[PDB]
């Protein structure tokens, strides 16, 4: 699959807030890895999330608990 390589390349560690869909190249301020394959879990005091996916050929992404607060603001 190219979803994992294609989506991560679009944005990686750039203050999750602005998301561009290379599908039609457009700025979507108010989305965070949404509409791609966002997946995460709560570890308690530190969230673990992979932008679009993770197949051993890529890596996870950290998120401070406070940063998790920013993601909710982005969607709504």
């Amino acid at each position: 699959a190219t979803l994992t390589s294609e989506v991560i390349k679009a944005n990686k560690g750039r203050e999750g807030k602005p998301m561009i869909s290379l599908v039609d190249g457009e700025e979507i301020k108010g989305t965070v890895y949404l509409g791609d394959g966002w997946s995460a879990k709560k570890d308690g005091a530190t969230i673990v999330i992979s932008p679009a996916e993770e197949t051993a050929l890529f890596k996870a992404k950290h998120i401070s608990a406070a940063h998790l607060k920013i993601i909710a603001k982005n969607l709504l």
Side-chain angles (χ1 to χ4, degrees):
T2 56
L3 180 81
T4 304
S5 187
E6 190 67 14
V7 175
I8 280 46
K9 288 166 71 169
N11 288 141
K12 185 171 78 172
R14 190 178 69 182
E15 290 179 350
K17 233 187 300 321
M19 185 180 170
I20 300 172
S21 182
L22 4 70
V23 181
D24 59 341
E26 61 181 348
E27 294 179 2
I28 309 173
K29 290 181 292 204
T31 36
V32 212
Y33 316 121
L34 192 150
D36 282 340
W38 61 270
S39 182
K41 68 190 191 67
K42 306 291 196 288
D43 189 351
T46 304
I47 310 320
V48 178
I49 169 262
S50 312
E53 290 197 4
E54 199 180 350
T55 84
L57 312 193
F58 300 89
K59 60 187 183 294
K61 185 180 186 174
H62 313 293
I63 266 194
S64 301
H67 282 323
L68 178 282
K69 200 83 178 40
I70 285 171
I71 293 170
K73 299 191 181 165
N74 299 161
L75 300 327
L76 43 130

